Every structure is written in C-alpha cells, then in structure tokens.
Ligand binder design. Sequence first.
Ligand code: SF4
Lengths: 165, 48, 55, 156, 115, 109, 202, 176, 350, 100
Amino acid sequence: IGIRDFIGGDLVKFDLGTWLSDVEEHKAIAMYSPHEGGYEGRYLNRLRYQGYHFLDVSARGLGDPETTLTKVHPVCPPHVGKQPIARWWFPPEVDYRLEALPSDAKGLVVWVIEAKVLSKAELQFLAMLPSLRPKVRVIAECGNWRKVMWKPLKEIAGLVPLQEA
Amino acid sequence: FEADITQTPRWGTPPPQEPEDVGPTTAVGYFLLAWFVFSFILSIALNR
Amino acid sequence: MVTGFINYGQQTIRAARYIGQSFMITLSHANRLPVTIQYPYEKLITSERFRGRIH
Amino acid sequence: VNGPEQLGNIQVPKRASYIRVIMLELSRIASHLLWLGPFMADIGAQTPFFYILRERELIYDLFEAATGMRMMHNYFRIGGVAADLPYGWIDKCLDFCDYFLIGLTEYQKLITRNPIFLERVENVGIIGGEEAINWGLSGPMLRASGIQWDLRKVDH
Amino acid sequence: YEYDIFWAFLIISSVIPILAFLFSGILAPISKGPEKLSSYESGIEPMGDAWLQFRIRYYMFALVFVVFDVETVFLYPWAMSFDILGVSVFIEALIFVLILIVGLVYAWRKGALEW
Amino acid sequence: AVTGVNNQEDLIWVLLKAGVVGFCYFLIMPPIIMNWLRIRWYRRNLLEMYFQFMFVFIFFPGILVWAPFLNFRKFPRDPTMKYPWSKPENPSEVKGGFLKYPWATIEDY
Amino acid sequence: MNSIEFPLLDQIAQNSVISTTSNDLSNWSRLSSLWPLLYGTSCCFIEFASLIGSRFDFDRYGLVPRASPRQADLILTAGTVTMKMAPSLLRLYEQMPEPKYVIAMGACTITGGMFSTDSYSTVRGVDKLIPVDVYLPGCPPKPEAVIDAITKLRKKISREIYEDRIKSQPKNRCFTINHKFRVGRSIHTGNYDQALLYKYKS
Amino acid sequence: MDLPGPIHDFLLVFLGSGLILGALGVVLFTNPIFSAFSLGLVLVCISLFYILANSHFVASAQLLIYVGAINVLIIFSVMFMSGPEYDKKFQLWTVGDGVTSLVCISLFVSLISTILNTSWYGIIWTTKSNQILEQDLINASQQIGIHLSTDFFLPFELISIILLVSLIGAIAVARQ
Amino acid sequence: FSRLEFLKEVYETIWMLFPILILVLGITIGVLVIVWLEREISASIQQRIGPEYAGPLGILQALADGTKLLFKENLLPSRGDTYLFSIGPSIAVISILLGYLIIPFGSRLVLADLSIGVFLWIAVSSIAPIGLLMSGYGSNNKYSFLGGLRAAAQSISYEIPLTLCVLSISLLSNSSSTVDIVEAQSKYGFWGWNLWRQPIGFIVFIISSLAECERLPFDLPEAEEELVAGYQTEYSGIKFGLFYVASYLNLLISSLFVTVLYLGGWNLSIPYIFISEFFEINKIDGVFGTTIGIFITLAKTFLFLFIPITTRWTLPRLRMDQLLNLGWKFLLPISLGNLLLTTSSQLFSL
Amino acid sequence: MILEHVLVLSAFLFSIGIYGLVTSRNLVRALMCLELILNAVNLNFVTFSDFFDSRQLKGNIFSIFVIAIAAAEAAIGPAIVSSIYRNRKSIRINQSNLLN
Ligand code: SF4
C-alpha cells in the first residue's frame, strides 16, 4: 500500500483533541508508536500539561501486577552471599503515588512500557485498573507501528469486541 | 646488557615483504607529464 | 645534482599513485551493498545457544 | 583452564585441543584487527576501523554460533571445552577464512604503502633487540627487534 | 554602487553571530555550577594555567612569512598592469621574483625552515 | 528607464519564467528526487550515488520543505497488517531471515 | 520508612501555539542528535565500538561521538568505575552542558556486576555518582539492546516540558570551614625517566 | 562614486569610535596579547577607512600584511613573555606616565588646532587638474598597478632589497 | 532631506537587502547540505546507512543538530577570558562569510563584482586564524592553546602558495574580478578552462585550500586524536556550531573558488567540436540561461565538494612538522615556478 | 561631508601611539605602538590621496611602501626581541640601563 502511507506522518496533526477525548472517555489506552521512539512525548506531554503525574512501570519485571501495584508486595533484595536472605515489604506503587500526590494534581497516569510481554489476564487487569482506582489512567505500549495509533486497552485485552477501525 | 656483545640479535633474515608494482607509477607519471606538455602547448597556442 | 631532482620526481609520483590507490580502494566500497542491520526495524536472529534473560 | 589442569595432570582430548587451537587463532585474528583499527584512528584514518569491524562481526558470529556469545564466551573448560562445534561450522569458518584473506589484501592495498601512513610510522619507536629482551617485551613487540621468539614453538 | 552592498553585507555578517548569541541566551537554560566551570583537563584536575613557550627555531618561519606576504602583495599590481605595459614590467618583476627565490634559498640553507 | 541597462525583457514574461522555474524546483523535482533516493537506495553504484548526491545538493532548498511532510519508515513484512493489532491470516507466507552483504544479493536489500 | 515527598510548586504556564510547539520542537531536536561522550573505560566500550561500526550504525540516530564534554549531550558509561576513576567520571559528567543524560550500560555500571562481591575498589553502580536516566542490564549488552536503551531514553526525552529545566539546575549549597590538615604537594609531579642513569645511588 | 552622505558620516563616526577604543586598549593593557588583539581592531577599522575613502587595494594590502604581522606578534609575545597573566590587567599608573600624558595631550592639541583651522575643502577646488582620471583606466587597481610599475621603479626594487636583507637579518639574529 | 529621493533610497536599500538575505538563507541551507553529504558519503564508503531517522532520509539531521546547539546551555570558562571566548568564533565566521560577496553564479548573479576581486577574498580569509588564536588563548586550556598555535602555523604555511596560485590566474585573465576570470575562461569554451592551462597551480590551489579549510590530512588544530577537540575543546552551545558552520562555509567557498578560477564557472560549451547539446545549452538566454548556469556551477562545485569529503575519510592525517615542510618546501617553490611559467607564456600575448 | 574628521582621528592615533611608545614596559608593545604611529601616517596619506590625487594615487603607493617598511621592522623585531630574550630572559626595557 502507498499514497497515503508515503504521505506526511508529520507531528503537527490535529489528532490531539481526539487523543485527550479518548483518554478521558477510555481510561485505559493501548498505544502504538514508531520503532525508534520519541514520537510518544507529543501525546504524553499534553496529559502532563493537564496536571497528570506519570508513573513509569516496566512490564518485563512487573511480576503479577495485581499485588505489585494494588497491594503491599514482598521483594527480596539481592544478597551476594555476604548477607542472609531478607524479605522486604514494599508499598503498593500506584496507591502510594496516588496518596502522595499534591492536591492540585489531576491524577496519575501509569505509563506501562513494553506491555507486549504481559499475558492476556495481566492486560485484563491493567485495563480494569482505573475502575478500582478512579484517578488513574493507564497507557501501555502494546507494540510498534509506522505511525502513532491508539485503541482502548479493554478492546486489545479482550473485554470488548475488536471493532474494525 | 649494554656492555654485552652476545645480546646483538642474530636470527638470519626476516621473511621478505611482498614485491612492489611499479607500472601504475609510470602510468601516472606519463599522465602528469603529458598534462604539463599539453598545458605548455595550450598556453602558447591560446595566447596568440 | 640533476639526479636529486629526478629522484624527487620519482618519489613524488609514487605518493600520488598510492594516494589514488587508497582513494580507489575506499571508493570501490560504494558499489557494495551495506552490511548495516537497521535496528529496531530489523532484528538479528539470535543463535540457538544465546545467553539472555533467564526463564 | 590449563593452569589447574596441569596441576591435576588432566589430559586434554585431541579434538578439544584442535578446537582450542582454532579458537585461539581466531581470537588472535580479532585482536590484531581491533589493534589495527584504533592504531589507524590515532594516525588519522577512521575508515579502517569500520573496515575491521565488518569482519570482526563475522568472527563474533562464528563465536556466538559456537560458544553462545560474541565476547565473554565461557567456552573453555578444564580438561576440554564446554561443548562440541555445532553442525555446519567447519564450512562457515572456511568461507570466513577465504573472505578474510581478500579483506586482508584490501587492507594492505589501502594502508601499507600510503605515503602519509609511512611518513607517520616509518621511523618512530626504534627498539633494540637487547633492550627488548631486557625490558621484558614479548610478542610482536619483541619479535619486531630481530628476535624470533614465539612461545607457541618454544613451549610446544 | 558596487560597494554599498559590501557595507550592507558586512553589517549583516556581523549581525548574524549577535542574533545567534541572543537566541541562545533567550532559549538555552543556565545551570552553572563550580564543577562545571572548571577547565577541562581530560578528567584530572588541571595543573598550572596553560602556557607552552615554544622554541625559537620552530617559529622562525613567521619572519619569512612576514616578508613573503609583502612580496606577494607587491606582485599583484604588476600582474594587473602586465598587459597594458609590455616586457618592461616583465624585466621589473623578474628581479622581484629572483630576490624572493634567493631569500627562500637562504632560509632553506640556513635551517630557518627546519623543524 | 536608466542608462546602463539595455534590452531588458518585459516583467510579465520574466515573472512567468521564474514562476515555472520555481514550480519545477520547489514542488515537482524534490518529490521525484526523494523517491529516487528512497527507491534504488541499495541498487546504487558509485556513479549513481554521485549523481543522486549531486541532485540532492542542487535541490536541497526544495527538499527542506517537503522533508517534514514525508515519512519513509519501513513497512511490515506481511502485506496484510492493516493495524498493529491485526493478526496475519497464515504466518508462513512471510519471508523471514533476510541476509546481508557477505551472503546476500540485491533481492534481500 | 524512607518515604517520598512532593515540594510546593506553582501552576505551569499553559499556552496555545508558541511555547508548546517550541518546546515540542526543542524536544525533537534533542531527540535526534544525542551526541555521546565517547567515554570508554572497560570491555563494554568494545560493544560501544561495535555500535560505532558498520553492522550497527550510530549515525542512524544521529549520535555522533564527540570527545569534548562541552559538545556532548549523553554520557554512555561503559565499563567498571574504580575508586581511582570515579571522581574523574563525576567531573566529566559535571563539565557536560545542560541538558545532559546518562545511560548506565553493563552490569558493572548498574550495581557493580561480578565485582559487586569481592572487589575492593569497584564502585557498585554510577547511580552513587551520577543521576542515571536509563539502566541497561547485561555483560557486554548486545548493540541492539544499547539501541533499545537509547530508544527508551528518547521516549523519556520527548516527554519533557519547560518545568523540567528548573528540575535540572543544581541548588548549589555550600559550607566552608578550616580543616587544620597537613597540606602536601602532588606525588605524581611528571618527572619520569629524566636523568635516570644518575639515580643509581649504590 | 561614494556612499550616501549620512551613511558615510555615520560610518566615519562609528569607525572612529572603534579605532579610539582599539588604540586605548593598545596603550592601556598590560598583557601584550590583549593589546595585540586591540591592535587588530585598529587594523580592521583602518582597513575599513581605506575602503571608505577610495582605497580598495590598499585596504586589502593592509588587511593581509598587517594581519600576518599581528599573528606573528601574538606568536612571539606568547613565546617571549612570562605566564599567561590574566591578572596583570591594566598596568599601574606612575608619575612618568602622567607627565607624558600631558605632553601627548599638548601635541595632539597642537595638531588639532591646525587641522580645525585649515580649510581642507579649499585645497580640493584648487587641485582640479589632478582629479581628471584617464577614461581608459576604469579599474582603480589597474591605475595603481600602472603607476607602481612606471612612476616608481627605483623604490620598487629598493623595497625588494630591503625585504631580502630584513629577512636575512631576522634569520641571523633570531637563530639559536 | 528630500522626501522624494529618501523614499527611493529606502526602497533601494530594501532591494539590495533582498539579495543579501536570500544568499544568507542559501548559505545556511548549503551548510546543512554539506553536513548531510559528508555523513552520507562516509556511510556509503564505509558500507553504512547514515542518518535515517531524523527526517525521511536524514535530511533534517543537520537542522536537528543546529537547533540542539541553539537549545544547549552556553558554557563559559571561569578561569579564562569571556570576551575573547565570545569574540573568536564570531570573527572567524565573519571573515569566512565575507568571501561570498564576490562569487558569481551567473554573468550578473553576483552580489558585488568588486574589481579588487579575489585579492579581497584572500585578505578577508587571512583574518579567521586570528579568531582561532583568540579562541585558543581565551579558553585557558592547554589543548585549546595547542590548537590555536597549530591553526596559526597552518595558516602561515599555506597562505602564500594559495596567494601565488591566485596571482597566476589573475595574470592569465589580466583582471582580479571573478566575472572577468570566468568570461576569459569562457572565450575558448571547454578548452579555455584554466585547469588545462595551469595544472600545477590547480594542484597547489587544491592542497592549499584543503589546508586553509583545515580538512584532513590538514586537520591538525582540531585533531581529535592528539588534542581532545583543539580550539573547540572548551566551546559549548552555539559557539561550537559557529565554529562548525565557519569550517563548512570555508569548504564551500573553496570549492566555489576552485570552479570559478580553474574550472569554467557557469560556462559549458565546446566551440571546437560540433557538440549539439553544448551549443543548444549555450544558446539559451534569459531566466533559463541563468538557471542552467547556476545548475552547472553547483555541479562543478559538488565535484570538488565530493573529492575532499572523500579525502577526509580515506587518507591518514599529517604531522605538524611535515605540514610545515609541505607548505614551505614543496608548495611554495613549485608555486613560484608556476608563476614564472605563467609569465613566460604570457609574454607571447603582448 | 565631514571627511576632515579622519585627519583628526589620525592625529589622535599618532599622539596615542606616541604615548604608547614612551610608557612601554614591554618592547613588543613598543613595536605595536610604532605600528600605530605608521598607521596614523598611512591614514593621513590615504585621505590626502583621496582629497587631491584621484588620478596619480601617489598617496596610496606611499601607503603601500610604508606598510612594507612597517612589516620589515616587524620582521627585524621581534628577532631582536628573540636575541634579547635568549641573552637576558627579560623583556622590560626600562630595567636595562647599563649603558648610561
Ligand atoms: S559488564 Fe562489567 S565486567 Fe563485564 S565487560 Fe562490561 S564492565 Fe567489564
């Protein structure tokens, strides 16, 4: 395919109002971006302009995001043979950041990088997270594409039938 | 070792390095000489 | 005395030839296909015993 | 791996020894390449760095096919090696040798007689053989002073 | 006129770095710190401030260059008037070029041009 | 007019010729040049690369305008991926394992 | 409990055309020209060299290596940082002009790696010395993984606003006292192999 | 054959102010490097003055020769002086400078009381026949070439001898 | 104060400003082109791709570099002098930009056909090494000091053969104006180029211009392997970009002076042969003729832009002593002999 | 026009150069002030050639010769400076008063 494909993928498009309307209507959004990156900041920047504070979460070492994000979770710091095994308990990340945000902030946006490595049920929970926490928006890079396109995360995870764009 | 005469290396001859190609040298020299002679002739002819 | 100028001539043409040889050797690589793997649009398939993340 | 295996009198099988010789010579080729690169960069030519890397990547590919990693192979073991050579490695290494001979001829055509390279290199760092012996030099440093001293042929 | 364009071009060429400096001043941030303002000496802490004091025999070509610049400046008007006049200016400038060659030979033989 | 200028052309014809030159230089030729740079990027010899770079050097004032409004990002392997969330019909007709310069032809790019 | 706290700040700015697009274009310009420091210390630098070479190209992202810190945006710390080198590394980072970015490549730069256990001079991670933006795990990380870390760094760079500039300037607090220590001149004075033959002293 | 009037006078005033600043920097700087760099500003302003009057060849000759001279001067001031000495910075004032300041002020006043009292425009209208150029010599550099080659032959070879002997003496004196 | 001629002169100042601004815009665009071309030629002869992601084919890479340097914090040395630090690169870029006033892209597409011509170009190009020395001294760095001294020595060595080579061409064309030189070449057409008549001056001019542009193998004041960055070691932000622009502008102006003085400029015709294409090209006059002349000048300039960009990435670099030896013992006597041969051949004309 | 102002500047330069010739504690600076004085003389010559000698250009030729002489002096010293620094390792001229 060509014509439209080889015509401007410029970053001056007026998709930003639709992007903000979608991120307000659909709380959890799957995002697809150029492989070399750097064309996501135009869309996250305006979210940060509305008072949203970003929490960067890597999905590779996420480790069962239910108890990692919404519960106190046990983690063992790495001993190198010089110490006995210690079991530390870490606070729920998204809730700690939520209760520690300033009162003027619009909310918290969870930027889940490399969300393709998560399974189906983990993406289900990541899509249904804003229902449990009202002031949380979920953005998850579920892949790469020539141009930035976003979909509801419930549609990708399988809660909503995948309507043709 | 500076005052010792047995420290001078004596191991024969090294493996010779590849020989050299000299034909393109003469070709380049002929090209430049012809260029200079053509310059002489052209300057004399065009000046008149 | 003339032999000095002649030797200067032959040790100058040689340098020009070898400079042209370097130019030719380098510019002959313009006719060859690139070896560059265009990451991240292209990824090299790892070996059967590549040591990466633990499972 | 040959310190302790000599301490414990462990023998090495002939196939493992041949694999070790092949890998050592390949590593010597790679080390001489990635010496030639920074050397010509310090002289002033940056293109030979990429030119050596074009073939050092092939050496890395051979090592990763055999050992599992480009560098830090963890392939040599006490009394042998980690694993046998994979299927289709001999022909790949032979084709690499055939290509690398041509690449080395290209390197010698580009660099060896260059007038600027010679005039930067021809008469720097003259080391006597006696000084090379006394200073404890070895390898290409000691061998470039009239001394035919290689520990591969001395120690068998 | 053929030289008002020269003055306008010189003014514009001088203005351009001023515009670049002003744009950098109003665009780039300032985050100065005592470690940042230290002189760069490849990581290590610089010793005494710079200064090299070359040898004289190295920098003796400059005294040749001063004279040769004047000679090449003097050769230009003769070349401009070589066609209007004839062999007279050829004979005139032949001595100039010969003196230039003799001075170059003297500098070569005395070791002024040796490093 | 003034003494010194002689036989100057009419302004309307000069304007028309300059307009057609600008039309060919700013919005016609830079697209063909950048397409000739994108296609046949790996098929160049030394002469073709030299002429490509010469044409880019000449027409760069017209290419600097079109370049922000063009993307040349490489396309997916299968010609069925309409969307990044789309799945291939059968994942066997794709061609995987493109080779490179030591062991590849121009077909592998 | 090592807790976290947000300080008191004002409202940002809000803009329609000029400031927002200017910030976006500045971010994009700093995306595509992240010139590395050419800082090499140990074995990982070899893989860094493999990213300068032909098979994996630095030039596709821009990313031309610049020797001087003043011309470098990104410092890509490749190699173990010993006690003898860590002050030099921190100077080199400080001498780089703002905005500047740090990528800790290698396991020895994240937490010390193999030397995290018994080395008596290896700094266990440059996060104790310099603020690291992107951590790159792996002993000789694959050059593609280095490009991925640089891609993630670009992902974070493009998200910047003008407010982040006042997050970057140092607060610069100081406190000066007398020490009554013993002041001694430098041991390495530069005198080496000069008049060596007269230094026998039987 | 000139710039517009107000532009010409403004350029005169501006280049004069720059020349005054450069000369004051020359005679007030302790560092020979700083005063040499001020001398370079003086050289550039004087070349611009030459371009202003009519001298398009003398300006280029001034730029070339005097730029070589200042580059050599900076090199030999670096080579023949103590440490870089940014702290020297406007050498101190003595009585021996104060008396000479008065003497030079008196000399400048004596010169300017003559310059301001002489009608320089009156002399121009008397030298009418000296300002009728030959119509064939359009290029001013062509006229300067013709009048250097024909009118001044003896100084043209005397300067060659002078340059050769100066080169020889500079090499012989400065050699180690 | 006449308000009839004052408005006319204001509009005239506008109509001389307009060529200056379009030339300046094209000059900065050309610096962008030279950066992109050098990167892509290096990638091609090193079997790489080059800039690919900043724009379609790396077209916006140099623009991204320029805007990054604009947004990069301006860093001043605390130990050194601020005024010399700020003045140096500005002087270099001014003295390099001043040489573009006399370059003709057509018979009348020249900003100023000054009869002093190429001599003024040499005079203004002599000034930049003073700016380099100023940058070296003001930075208060040993590497910067060495780079400044090396730049001064390089300019001193290679100013004279270039001057004599330009003098020989001016003697052949009997005029210092660039338009006169190009037309004198265009009298005899393709055989009338000074490249064939003056080969020795051609080679010496190439070598001297490469040394003055400080391109490799004459990149000693900025040699990255010997000094960290040379005189640019302590320079950050927009000033390094200025010292980069000035270098690429010097390369472009040297290539333009190569195609003007030694090649035929905008001329492309062979009168001694029945070349239908060349005759039809030369038969066009007007707007199209000027456009074709600009095209020909740009192509001939790109040839001697391609050659030194290759030269940087092929040869090793010289040494300071060998640079001085080449400048003072191989180029200067040869240029003197070329001038003598030019005068002897020109004796036949009168 | 106000062309006579150039003359004024030349006179100023002369006086300033004269001042810099006397209070010079560095012989390189004294050489530079000699260049300043010769430059003032050259400014006078060039503006007088503009005023009265538009055809013969005798003032311009004299300016060229004065520039040549100034460069010859600038070549002879600092070679004299080189000899002085090689023999005494000091440049300050007022400190050398042996011959008195
Ligand atoms: S990861 Fe650490 S130990 Fe391994 S090569 Fe890199 S720096 Fe050395």
